[PDB]
mmCIF file of C-alpha atoms (C1' of nucleotides) and ligand atoms in Angstrom:
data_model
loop_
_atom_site.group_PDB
_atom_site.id
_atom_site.type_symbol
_atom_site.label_atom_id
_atom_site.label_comp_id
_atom_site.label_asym_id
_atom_site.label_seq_id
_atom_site.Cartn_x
_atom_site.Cartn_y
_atom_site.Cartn_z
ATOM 1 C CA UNK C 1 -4.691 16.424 -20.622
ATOM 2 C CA UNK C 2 -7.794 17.804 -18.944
ATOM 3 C CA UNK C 3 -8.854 20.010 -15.826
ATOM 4 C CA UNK C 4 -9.972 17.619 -13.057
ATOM 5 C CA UNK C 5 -11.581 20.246 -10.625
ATOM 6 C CA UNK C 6 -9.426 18.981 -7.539
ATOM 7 C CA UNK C 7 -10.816 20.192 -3.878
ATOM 8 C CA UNK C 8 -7.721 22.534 -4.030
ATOM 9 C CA UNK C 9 -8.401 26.026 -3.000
ATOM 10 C CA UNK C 10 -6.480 29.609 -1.928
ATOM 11 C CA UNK C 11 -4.907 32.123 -4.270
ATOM 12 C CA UNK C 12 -2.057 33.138 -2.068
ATOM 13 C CA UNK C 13 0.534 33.913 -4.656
ATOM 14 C CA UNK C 14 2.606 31.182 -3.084
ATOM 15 C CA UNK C 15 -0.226 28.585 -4.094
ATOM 16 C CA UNK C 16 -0.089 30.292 -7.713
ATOM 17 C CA UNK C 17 3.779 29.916 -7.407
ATOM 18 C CA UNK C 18 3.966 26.174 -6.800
ATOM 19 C CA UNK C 19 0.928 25.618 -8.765
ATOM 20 C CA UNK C 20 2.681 27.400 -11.859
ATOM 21 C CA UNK C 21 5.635 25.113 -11.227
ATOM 22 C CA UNK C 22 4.393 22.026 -10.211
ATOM 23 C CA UNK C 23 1.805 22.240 -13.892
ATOM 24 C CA UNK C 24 4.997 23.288 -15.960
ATOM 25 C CA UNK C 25 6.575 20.102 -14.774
ATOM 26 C CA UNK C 26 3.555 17.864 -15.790
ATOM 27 C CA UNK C 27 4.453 17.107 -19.240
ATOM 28 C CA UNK C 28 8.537 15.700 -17.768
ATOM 29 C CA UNK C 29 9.800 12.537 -17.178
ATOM 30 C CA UNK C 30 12.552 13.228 -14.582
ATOM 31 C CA UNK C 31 11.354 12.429 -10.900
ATOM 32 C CA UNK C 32 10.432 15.155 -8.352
ATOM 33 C CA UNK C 33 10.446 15.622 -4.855
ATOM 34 C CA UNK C 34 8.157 17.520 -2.689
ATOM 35 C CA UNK C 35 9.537 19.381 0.666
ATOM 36 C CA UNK C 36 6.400 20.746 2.868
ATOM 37 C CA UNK C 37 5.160 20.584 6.482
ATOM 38 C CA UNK C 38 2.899 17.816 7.526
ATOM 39 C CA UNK C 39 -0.246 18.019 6.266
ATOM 40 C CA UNK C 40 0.380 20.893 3.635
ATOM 41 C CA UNK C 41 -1.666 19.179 0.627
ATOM 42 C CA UNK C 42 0.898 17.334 -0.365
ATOM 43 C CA UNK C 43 -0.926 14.531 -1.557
ATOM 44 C CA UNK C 44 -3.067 16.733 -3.860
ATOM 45 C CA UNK C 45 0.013 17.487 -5.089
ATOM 46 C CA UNK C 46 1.693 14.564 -6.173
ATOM 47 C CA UNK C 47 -2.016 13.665 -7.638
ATOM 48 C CA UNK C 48 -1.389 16.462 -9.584
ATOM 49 C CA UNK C 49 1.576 15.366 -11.435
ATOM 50 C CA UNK C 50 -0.134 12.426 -13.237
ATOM 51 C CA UNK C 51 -3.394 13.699 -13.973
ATOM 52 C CA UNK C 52 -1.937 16.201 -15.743
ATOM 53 C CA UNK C 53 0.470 14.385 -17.517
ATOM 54 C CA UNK C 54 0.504 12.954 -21.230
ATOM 55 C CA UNK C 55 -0.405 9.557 -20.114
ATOM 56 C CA UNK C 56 -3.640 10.707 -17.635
ATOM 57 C CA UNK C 57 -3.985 6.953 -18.353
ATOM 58 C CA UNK C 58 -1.271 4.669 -17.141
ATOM 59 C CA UNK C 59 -1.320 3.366 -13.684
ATOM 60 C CA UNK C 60 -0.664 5.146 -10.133
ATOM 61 C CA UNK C 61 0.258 2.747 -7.196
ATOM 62 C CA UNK C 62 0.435 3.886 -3.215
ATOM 63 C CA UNK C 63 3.979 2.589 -2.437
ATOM 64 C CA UNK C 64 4.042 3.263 1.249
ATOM 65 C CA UNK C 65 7.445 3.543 2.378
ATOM 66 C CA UNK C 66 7.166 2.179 5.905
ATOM 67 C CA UNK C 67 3.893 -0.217 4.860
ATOM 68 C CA UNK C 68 5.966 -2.638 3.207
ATOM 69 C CA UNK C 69 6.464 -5.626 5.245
ATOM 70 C CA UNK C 70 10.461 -5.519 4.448
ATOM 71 C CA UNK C 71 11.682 -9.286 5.402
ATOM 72 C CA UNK C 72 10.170 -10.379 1.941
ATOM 73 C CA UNK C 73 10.085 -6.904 -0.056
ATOM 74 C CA UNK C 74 12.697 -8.464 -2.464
ATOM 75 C CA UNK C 75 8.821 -9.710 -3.889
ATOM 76 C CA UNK C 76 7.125 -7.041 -3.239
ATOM 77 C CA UNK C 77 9.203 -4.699 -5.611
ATOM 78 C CA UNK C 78 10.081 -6.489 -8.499
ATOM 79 C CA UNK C 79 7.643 -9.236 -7.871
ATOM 80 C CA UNK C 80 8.796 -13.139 -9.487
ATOM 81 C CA UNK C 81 8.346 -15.843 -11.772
ATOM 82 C CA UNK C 82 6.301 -18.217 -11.302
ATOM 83 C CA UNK C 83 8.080 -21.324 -9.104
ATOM 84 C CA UNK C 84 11.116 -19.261 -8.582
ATOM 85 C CA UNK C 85 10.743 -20.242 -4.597
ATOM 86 C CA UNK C 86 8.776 -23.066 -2.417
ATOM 87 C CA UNK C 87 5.026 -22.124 -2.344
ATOM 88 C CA UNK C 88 4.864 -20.283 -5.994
ATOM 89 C CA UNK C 89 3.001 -21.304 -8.347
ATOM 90 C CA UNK C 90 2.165 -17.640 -10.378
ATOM 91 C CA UNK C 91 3.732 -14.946 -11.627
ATOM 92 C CA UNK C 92 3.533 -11.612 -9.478
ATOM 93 C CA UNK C 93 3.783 -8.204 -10.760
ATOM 94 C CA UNK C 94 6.501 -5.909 -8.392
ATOM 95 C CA UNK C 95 5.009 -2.463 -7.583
ATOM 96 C CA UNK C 96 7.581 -1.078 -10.296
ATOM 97 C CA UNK C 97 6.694 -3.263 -13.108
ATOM 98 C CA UNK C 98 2.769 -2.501 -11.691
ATOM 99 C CA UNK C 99 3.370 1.012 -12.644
ATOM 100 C CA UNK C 100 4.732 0.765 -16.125
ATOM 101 C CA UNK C 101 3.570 3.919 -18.051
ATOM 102 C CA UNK C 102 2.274 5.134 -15.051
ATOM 103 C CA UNK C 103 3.820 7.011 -11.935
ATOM 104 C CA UNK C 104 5.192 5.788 -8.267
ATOM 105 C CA UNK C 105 4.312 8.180 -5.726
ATOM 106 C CA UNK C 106 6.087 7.268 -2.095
ATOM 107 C CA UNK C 107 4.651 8.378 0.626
ATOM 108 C CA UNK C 108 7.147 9.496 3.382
ATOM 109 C CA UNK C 109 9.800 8.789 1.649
ATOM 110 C CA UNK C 110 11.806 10.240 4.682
ATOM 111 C CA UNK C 111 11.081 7.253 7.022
ATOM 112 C CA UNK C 112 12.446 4.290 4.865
ATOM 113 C CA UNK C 113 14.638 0.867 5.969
ATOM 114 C CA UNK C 114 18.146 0.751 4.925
ATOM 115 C CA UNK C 115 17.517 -2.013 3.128
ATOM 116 C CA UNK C 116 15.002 -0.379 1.208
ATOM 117 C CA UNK C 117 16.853 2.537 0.172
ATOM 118 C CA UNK C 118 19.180 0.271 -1.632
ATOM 119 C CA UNK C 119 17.646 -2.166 -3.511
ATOM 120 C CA UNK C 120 15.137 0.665 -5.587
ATOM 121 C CA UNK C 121 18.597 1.883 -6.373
ATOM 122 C CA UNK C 122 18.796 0.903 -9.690
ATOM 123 C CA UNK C 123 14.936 0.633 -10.869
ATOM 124 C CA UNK C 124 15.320 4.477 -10.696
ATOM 125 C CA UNK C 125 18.255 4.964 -12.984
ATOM 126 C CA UNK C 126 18.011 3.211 -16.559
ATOM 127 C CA UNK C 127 14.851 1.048 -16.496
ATOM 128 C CA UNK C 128 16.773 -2.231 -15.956
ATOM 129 C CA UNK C 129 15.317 -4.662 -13.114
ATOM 130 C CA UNK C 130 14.776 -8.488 -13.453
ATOM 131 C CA UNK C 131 11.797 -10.592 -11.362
ATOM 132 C CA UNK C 132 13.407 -12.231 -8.043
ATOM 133 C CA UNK C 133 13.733 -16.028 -9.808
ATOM 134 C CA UNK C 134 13.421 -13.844 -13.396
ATOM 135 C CA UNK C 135 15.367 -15.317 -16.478
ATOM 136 C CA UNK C 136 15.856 -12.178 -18.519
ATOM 137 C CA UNK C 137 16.014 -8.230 -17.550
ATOM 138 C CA UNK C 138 12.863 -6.210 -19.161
ATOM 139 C CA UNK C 139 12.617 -2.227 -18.921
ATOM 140 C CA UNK C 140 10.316 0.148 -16.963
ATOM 141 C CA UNK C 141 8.980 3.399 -18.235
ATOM 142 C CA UNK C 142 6.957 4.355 -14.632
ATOM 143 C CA UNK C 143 8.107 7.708 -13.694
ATOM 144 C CA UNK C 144 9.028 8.495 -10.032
ATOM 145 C CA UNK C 145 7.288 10.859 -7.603
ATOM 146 C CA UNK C 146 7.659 11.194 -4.046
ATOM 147 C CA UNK C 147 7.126 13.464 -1.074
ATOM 148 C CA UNK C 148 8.456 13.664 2.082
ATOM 149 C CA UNK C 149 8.058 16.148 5.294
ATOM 150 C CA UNK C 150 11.047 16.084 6.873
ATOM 151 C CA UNK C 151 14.488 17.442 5.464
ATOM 152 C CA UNK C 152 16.155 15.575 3.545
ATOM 153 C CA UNK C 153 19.913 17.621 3.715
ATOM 154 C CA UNK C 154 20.699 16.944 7.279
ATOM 155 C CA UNK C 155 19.383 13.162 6.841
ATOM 156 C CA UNK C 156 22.240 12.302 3.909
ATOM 157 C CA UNK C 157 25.183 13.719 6.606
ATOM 158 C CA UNK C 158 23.069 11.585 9.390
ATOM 159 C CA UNK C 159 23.512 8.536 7.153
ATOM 160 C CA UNK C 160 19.831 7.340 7.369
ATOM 161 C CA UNK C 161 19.522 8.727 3.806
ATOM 162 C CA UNK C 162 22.446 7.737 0.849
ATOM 163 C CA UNK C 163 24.518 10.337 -0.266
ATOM 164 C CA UNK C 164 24.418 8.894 -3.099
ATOM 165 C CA UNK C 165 20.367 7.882 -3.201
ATOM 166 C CA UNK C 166 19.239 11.627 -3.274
ATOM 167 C CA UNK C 167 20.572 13.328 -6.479
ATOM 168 C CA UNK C 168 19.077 10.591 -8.106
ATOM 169 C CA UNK C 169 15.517 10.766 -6.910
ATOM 170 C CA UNK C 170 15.485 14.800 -6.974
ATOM 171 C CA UNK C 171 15.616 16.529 -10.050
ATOM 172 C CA UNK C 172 13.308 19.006 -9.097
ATOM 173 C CA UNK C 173 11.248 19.873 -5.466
ATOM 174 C CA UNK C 174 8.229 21.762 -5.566
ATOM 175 C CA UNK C 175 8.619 22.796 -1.943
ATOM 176 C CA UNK C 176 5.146 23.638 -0.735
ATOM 177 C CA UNK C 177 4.474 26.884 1.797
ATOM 178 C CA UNK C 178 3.351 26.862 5.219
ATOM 179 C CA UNK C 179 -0.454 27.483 5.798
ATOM 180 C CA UNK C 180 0.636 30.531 8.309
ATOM 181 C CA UNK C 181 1.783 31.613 5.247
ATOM 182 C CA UNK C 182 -0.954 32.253 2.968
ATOM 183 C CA UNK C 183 -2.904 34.404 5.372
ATOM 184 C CA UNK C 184 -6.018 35.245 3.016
ATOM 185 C CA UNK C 185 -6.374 31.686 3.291
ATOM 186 C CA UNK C 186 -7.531 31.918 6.279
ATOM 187 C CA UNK C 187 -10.679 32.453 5.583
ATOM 188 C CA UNK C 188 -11.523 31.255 2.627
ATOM 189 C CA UNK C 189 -10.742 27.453 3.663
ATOM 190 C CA UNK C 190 -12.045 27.817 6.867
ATOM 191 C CA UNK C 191 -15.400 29.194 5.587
ATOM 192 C CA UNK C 192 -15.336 26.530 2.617
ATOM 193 C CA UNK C 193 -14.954 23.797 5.534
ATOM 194 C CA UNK C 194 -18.081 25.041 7.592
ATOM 195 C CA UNK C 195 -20.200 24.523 4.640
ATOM 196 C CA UNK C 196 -18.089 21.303 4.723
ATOM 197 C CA UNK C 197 -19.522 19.937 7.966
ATOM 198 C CA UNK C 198 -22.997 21.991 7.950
ATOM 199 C CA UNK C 199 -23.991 19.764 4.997
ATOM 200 C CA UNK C 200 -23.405 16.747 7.420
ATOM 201 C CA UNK C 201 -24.892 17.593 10.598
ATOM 202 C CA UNK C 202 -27.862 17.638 8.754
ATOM 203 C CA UNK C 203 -28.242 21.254 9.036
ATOM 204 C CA UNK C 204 -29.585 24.117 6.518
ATOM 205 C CA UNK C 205 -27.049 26.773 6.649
ATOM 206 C CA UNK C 206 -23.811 28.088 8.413
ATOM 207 C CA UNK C 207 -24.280 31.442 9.941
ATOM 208 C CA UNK C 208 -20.777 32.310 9.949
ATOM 209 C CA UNK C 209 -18.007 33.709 12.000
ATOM 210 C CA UNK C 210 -17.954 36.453 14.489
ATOM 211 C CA UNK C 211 -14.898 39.047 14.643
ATOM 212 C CA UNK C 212 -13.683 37.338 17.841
ATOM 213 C CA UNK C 213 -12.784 34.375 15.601
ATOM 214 C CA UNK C 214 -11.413 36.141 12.728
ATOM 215 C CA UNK C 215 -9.089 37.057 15.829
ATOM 216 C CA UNK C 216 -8.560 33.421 17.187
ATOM 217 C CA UNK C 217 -7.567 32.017 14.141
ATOM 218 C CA UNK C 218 -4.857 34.944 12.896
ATOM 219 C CA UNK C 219 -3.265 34.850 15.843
ATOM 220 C CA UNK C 220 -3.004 31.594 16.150
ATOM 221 C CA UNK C 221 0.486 30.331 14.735
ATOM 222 C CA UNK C 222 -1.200 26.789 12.851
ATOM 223 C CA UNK C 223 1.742 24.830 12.825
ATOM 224 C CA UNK C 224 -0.518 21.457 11.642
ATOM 225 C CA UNK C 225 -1.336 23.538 8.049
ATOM 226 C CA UNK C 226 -4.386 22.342 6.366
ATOM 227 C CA UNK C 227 -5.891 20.699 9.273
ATOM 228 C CA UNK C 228 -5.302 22.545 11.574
ATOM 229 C CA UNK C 229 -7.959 24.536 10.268
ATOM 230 C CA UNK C 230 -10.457 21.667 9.474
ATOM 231 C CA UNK C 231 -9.907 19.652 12.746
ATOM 232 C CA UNK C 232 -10.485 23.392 14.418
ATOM 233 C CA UNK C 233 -13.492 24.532 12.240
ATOM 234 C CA UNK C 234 -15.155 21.182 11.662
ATOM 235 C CA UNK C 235 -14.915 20.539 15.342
ATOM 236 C CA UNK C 236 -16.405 23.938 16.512
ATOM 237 C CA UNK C 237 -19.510 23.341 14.331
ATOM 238 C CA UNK C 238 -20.399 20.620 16.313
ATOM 239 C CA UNK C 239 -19.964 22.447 19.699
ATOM 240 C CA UNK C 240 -22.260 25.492 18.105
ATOM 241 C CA UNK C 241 -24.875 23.527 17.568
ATOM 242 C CA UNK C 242 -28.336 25.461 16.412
ATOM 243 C CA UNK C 243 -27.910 27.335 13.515
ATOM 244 C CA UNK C 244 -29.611 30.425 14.496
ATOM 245 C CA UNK C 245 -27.159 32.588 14.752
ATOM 246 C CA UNK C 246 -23.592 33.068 14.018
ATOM 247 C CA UNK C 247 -20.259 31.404 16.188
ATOM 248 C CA UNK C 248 -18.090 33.648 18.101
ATOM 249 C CA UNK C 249 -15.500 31.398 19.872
ATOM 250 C CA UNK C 250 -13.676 27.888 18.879
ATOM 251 C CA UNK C 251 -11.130 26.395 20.842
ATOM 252 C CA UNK C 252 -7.990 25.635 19.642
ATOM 253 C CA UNK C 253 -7.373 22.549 21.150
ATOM 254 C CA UNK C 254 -9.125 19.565 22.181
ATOM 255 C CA UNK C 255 -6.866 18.320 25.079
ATOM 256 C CA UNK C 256 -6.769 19.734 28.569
ATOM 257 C CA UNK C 257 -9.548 20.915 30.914
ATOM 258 C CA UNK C 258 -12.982 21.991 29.727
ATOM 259 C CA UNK C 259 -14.544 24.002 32.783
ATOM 260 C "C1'" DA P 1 -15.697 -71.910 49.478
ATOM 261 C "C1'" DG P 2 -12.077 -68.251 48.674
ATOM 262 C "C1'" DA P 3 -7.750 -66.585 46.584
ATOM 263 C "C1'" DC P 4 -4.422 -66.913 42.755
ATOM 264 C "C1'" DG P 5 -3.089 -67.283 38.107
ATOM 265 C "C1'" DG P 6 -4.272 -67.478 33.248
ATOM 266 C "C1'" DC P 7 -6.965 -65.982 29.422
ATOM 267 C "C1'" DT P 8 -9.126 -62.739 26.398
ATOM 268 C "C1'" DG P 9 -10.665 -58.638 24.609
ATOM 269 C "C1'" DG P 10 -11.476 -53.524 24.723
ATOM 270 C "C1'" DC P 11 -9.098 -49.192 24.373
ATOM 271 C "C1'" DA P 12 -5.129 -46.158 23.946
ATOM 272 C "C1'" DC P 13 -0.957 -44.176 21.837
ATOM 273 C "C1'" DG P 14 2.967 -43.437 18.653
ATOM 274 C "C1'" DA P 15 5.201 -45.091 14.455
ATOM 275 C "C1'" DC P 16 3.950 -45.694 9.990
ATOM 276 C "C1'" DT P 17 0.921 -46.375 5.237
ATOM 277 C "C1'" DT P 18 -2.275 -44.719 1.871
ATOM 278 C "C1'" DT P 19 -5.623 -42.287 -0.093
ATOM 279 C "C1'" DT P 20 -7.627 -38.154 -2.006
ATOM 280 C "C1'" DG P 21 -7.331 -33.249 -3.896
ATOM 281 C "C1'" DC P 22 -4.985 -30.386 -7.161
ATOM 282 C "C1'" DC P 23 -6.351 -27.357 -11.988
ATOM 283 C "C1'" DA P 24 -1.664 -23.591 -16.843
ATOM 284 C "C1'" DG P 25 0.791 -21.859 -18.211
ATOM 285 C "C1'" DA P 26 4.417 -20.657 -21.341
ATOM 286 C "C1'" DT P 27 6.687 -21.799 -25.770
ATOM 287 C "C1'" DC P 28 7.164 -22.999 -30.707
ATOM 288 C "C1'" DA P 29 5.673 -23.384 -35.652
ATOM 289 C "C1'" DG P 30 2.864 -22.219 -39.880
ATOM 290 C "C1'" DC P 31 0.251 -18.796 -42.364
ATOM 291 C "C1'" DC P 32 -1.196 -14.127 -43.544
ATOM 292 C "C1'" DC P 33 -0.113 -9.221 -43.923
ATOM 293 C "C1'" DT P 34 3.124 -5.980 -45.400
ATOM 294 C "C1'" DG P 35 7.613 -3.901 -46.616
ATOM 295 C "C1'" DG P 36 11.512 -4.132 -49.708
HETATM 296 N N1 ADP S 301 -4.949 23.566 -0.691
HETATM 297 C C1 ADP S 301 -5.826 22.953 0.140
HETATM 298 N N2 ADP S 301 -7.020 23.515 0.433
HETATM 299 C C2 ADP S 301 -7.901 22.915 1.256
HETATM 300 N N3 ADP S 301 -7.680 21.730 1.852
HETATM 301 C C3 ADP S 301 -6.521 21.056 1.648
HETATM 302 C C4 ADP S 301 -5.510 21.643 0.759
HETATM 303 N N4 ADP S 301 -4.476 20.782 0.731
HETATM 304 C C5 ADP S 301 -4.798 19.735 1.532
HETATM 305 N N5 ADP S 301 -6.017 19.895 2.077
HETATM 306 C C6 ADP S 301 -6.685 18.947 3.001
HETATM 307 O O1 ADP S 301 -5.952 18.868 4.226
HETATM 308 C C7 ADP S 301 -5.485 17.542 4.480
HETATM 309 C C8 ADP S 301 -3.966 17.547 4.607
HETATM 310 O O2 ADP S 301 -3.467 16.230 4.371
HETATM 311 P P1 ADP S 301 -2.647 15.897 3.027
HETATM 312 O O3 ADP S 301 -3.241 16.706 1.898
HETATM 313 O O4 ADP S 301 -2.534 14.396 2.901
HETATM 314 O O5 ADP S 301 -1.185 16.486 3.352
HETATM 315 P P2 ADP S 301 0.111 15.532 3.296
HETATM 316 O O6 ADP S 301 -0.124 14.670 2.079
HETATM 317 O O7 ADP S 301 1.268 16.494 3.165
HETATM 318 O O8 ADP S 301 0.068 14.784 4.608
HETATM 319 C C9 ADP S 301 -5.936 16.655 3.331
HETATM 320 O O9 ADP S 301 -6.728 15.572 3.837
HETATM 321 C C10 ADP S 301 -6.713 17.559 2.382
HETATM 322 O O10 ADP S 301 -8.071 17.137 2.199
#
DNA sequence: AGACGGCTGGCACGACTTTTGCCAGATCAGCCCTGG
C-alpha cells in the first residue's frame, strides 16, 4: 500500500466517516456498492478501493454499464477462443478475465439491460466462467466494485433490478453524503477551484470572494454536489475578468435571460 | 442511281472462371531441478 495524494478534499466529519470506512474496507475481497447523488466523487471513490488495496498492482478496467454494445456482449464479457465463430481467428480476453487480480468498477450500475444483469450472474459468485466457444472453465480472482446514483431498493420491487442480483453484488455500501451537507466545504472547495481556473486564464492571482457570495452560495440548496460548485465558481472567474480586485456576485445558473 | 438486305465488328451486360493474398498458434515430449 501507499498514499497516492488524490485531488480529494473537505474534512466534514461525514468525509472522515466514509473515508474511515471506505480505507477499512481496502484490504477485503467481498464487492461493494456505493449509494450517492450524482456527481458526489464517486469515482474518486471507487479509485480508492484499489489503490489502496494489497494488489495496488493488478488491473482496473472501465466496464460501462450502458457502453456495451449488448447484441454481441456474450464477447465482450467473457471474450472467446480463437475460431469459436465465422470471422475469428484470435483469442479475446472478456472484461472479467481482463481484470484477473485486479478490480471491476461499473459505472451506473443502475441503468443496465436485462440481459446484462443476467449473464454477469455467475462470474460474481464462485470464479467459474468459460470463453463463448471455450473448451474448459478457468477461475477469476478480479474483485467487484460498482457505484450507482439512483436507489437501488425500489428498483428490485420495479423488476428492472433482480431480486436476486443485489445481495450478491452488495456486501457493503459506502453511501456517500450530499455536498449541502458538508457545509465548511463550502468554502474550502470553492476557493481551491478559483485557484483551479486562475492558473488557466493565464492570470497571477485570485482575489477572492466578497461576503455577498459567501451568501449566494449557503443559501443556495446545490443539488448537482461537487459541480455544482466548480461549474458555478469556474464559470464566474471568467465573467470577473481583471484580477484587481475581489468578486462579489456569481450567478447560479447559466440558462435564462442575461439583461 | 437509289433502296434493301447481308455482313462484320465494336461495345455492353450478366453468368461464370481464376488468380492472388493470407501469415500461429497451441500442444506434446524429453531433460533438468528438486522433493521424497
Ligand atoms: N471530495 C471532492 N472534492 C473536490 N472535488 C471533487 C470531490 N469529489 C469529486 N470531485 C470532482 O467533482 C466531479 C464530480 O464527478 P464524479 O467525481 O465523477 O462523481 P460521480 O462519479 O459520482 O459522477 C469530479 O469530476 C471530481 O473532479
Amino acid at each position: 500500500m501507499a498514499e497516492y495524494k488524490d485531488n480529494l478534499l473537505g474534512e466534514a466529519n461525514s468525509f472522515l466517516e466514509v473515508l474511515e470506512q471506505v480505507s477499512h474496507l481496502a484490504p477485503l475481497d467481498k464487492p461493494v456498492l456505493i449509494i450517492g447523488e450524482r456527481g458526489t466523487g464517486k469515482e474518486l471513490i471507487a479509485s480508492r478501493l484499489h489503490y489502496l488495496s494489497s494488489r495496488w498492482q493488478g488491473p482496473f478496467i472501465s466496464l460501462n454499464c450502458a457502453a456495451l454494445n449488448e447484441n454481441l456482449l456474450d464477447s465482450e464479457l467473457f471474450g472467446h477462443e480463437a475460431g469459436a465463430f465465422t470471422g475469428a481467428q484470435k483469442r479475446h480476453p472478456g472484461r472479467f478475465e481482463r481484470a484477473d487480480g485486479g478490480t471491476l468498477f461499473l459505472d451506473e450500475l443502475a441503468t443496465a439491460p436485462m440481459m446484462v444483469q443476467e449473464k454477469l450472474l455467475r462470474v460474481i459468485e464462485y470464479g467459474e466462467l468459460e470463453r463463448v466457444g471455450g473448451s474448459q472453465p478457468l477461475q477469476v480472482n478480479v474483485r467487484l466494485v460498482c457505484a450507482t446514483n439512483a436507489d437501488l431498493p425500489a428498483m428490485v420491487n420495479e423488476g428492472t433490478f433482480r431480486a436476486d442480483l443485489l445481495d450478491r453484488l452488495a456486501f457493503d455500501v459506502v453511501q456517500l453524503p450530499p455536498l449541502r451537507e458538508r457545509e465548511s466545504d463550502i468554502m474550502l472547495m470553492a476557493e481551491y477551484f478559483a485557484i483551479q481556473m486562475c492558473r488557466e486564464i493565464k492570470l497571477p492571482l485570485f482575489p477572492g470572494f466578497t461576503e455577498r457570495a459567501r451568501e449566494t452560495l449557503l443559501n443556495y440548496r446545490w443539488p448537482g454536489n461537487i459541480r455544482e460548485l466548480k461549474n458555478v465558481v469556474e464559470r464566474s472567474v471568467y465573467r470577473h475578468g481583471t484580477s484587481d480586485y475581489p468578486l462579489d456576485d456569481i450567478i447560479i445558473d447559466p440558462f435564462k435571460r442575461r439583461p
